[PDB]
């Protein structure tokens, strides 16, 4: 169910927004693409999602939750097998919890998906 | 992700057989249902295994792991809000996992899916 | 593709809507339900929404197409071998097309989904 | 819920097979993307089949009809607004129909699914 975390760089905290910079490898094996479920395997909005919250939720805003999705936007699927960079910015002050999945293959690094997501304080 | 339990039986033990039922419930909250995801929300089979895979490693093989579905058959379609019987049947002289859900409504009670799947010890 | 004709009504013209009901079979072996494609089979969307247009307008907006769709609801999975009443009603004057499915088993009638479409004149 | 046809070349026939390519574009328009039914638009197989089924038994097999997909395989998913090389070959020996399609993009050319389909006289 999870990625293949292949490095996780130091939060780079500014005034109100920290950010996390994540390299993660789109396993083959995962229940995502088993063929029992799909002949045409790529990492759906729910997976990218969950990856995201589940992140962002543990390395910089430890204390809060889902609350909605202000906007998101899938550019290009993501193929079993895949090296992704994933980049995760907090601005605490208006909630906002914005994320960004690029694919890298050789010299390029095209956008996979991006979006916007709400949070709120857990048990606010 | 997860679904919210609702009862938890305790472990019926046989000769080589260990059961297990639950009664859970499928949250409309679940990512799974996200309607920038979906128009037609239904709990996906990754999810119906993901959470088979939960439980039974959780509370009848605890030193086991997937290894591949023997089969897998899904008759009636899971929707927002259901409530849920999920039945494990693990026989580790086999090394498999049966599963079984099975929705509850009024007085009937339909199986919605079912299947086989084999474990695998783990770091063995 | 397209669903197994089981019965046409004649056209009920009333004031300005103008109405047809066709029972249909929705046979285990369409595309839509092919083992390569899917594992839990069962009539998507678009399926649903191409078979309204269809009939929508080679029987009641001869010179009419889709523009968008207002709102659609989809309240009950339409599965591989079952037989439903389709009720399809045009107001030319608000220019909106109003469809509804059910599912027809034993002595029940379930809504499975139902909508409003917007069409516009072709080549308007 | 057809492609744009750009371009159709003639027949090829060799000693055993018949052949045929198309240029199609992938309109953004297709029932297959409308936001009411996905957030993470790709043409399914069961388009990308019934295209296939289509153009051959209209240019080739004009007297025959599916059977059975012998084998398929999606490499890569095919976005809305994408433009396809579409290559049908039949062998009416074997009675085996294969595809291929191809996204151009650029200079590059790249397979997004390929497969073989059997087919049968119709009313034989």
Do not use: C
Request: hydrophobic residues 40%.
């Amino acid at each position: 169910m999870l990625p293949v975390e292949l490095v996780r760089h130091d939060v780079k905290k500014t005034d109100e927004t920290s950010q996390v910079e994540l390299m993660l490898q789109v396993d083959p094996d995962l229940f995502w693409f088993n063929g029992h479920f799909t002949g045409q395997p790529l990492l759906p909005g729910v997976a990218q999602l969950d990856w995201v919250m589940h992140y962002a939720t543990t390395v910089l805003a430890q204390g809060w939750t889902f609350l909605s999705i202000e906007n998101i936007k899938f550019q290009q699927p993501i193929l079993p097998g895949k090296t992704l960079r994933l980049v995760l910015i907090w601005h605490a002050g208006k909630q906002s919890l914005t994320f960004s999945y690029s694919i890298l293959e050789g010299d390029t690094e095209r956008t996979a998906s991006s979006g916007k997501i709400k949070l709120t304080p857990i048990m606010e």
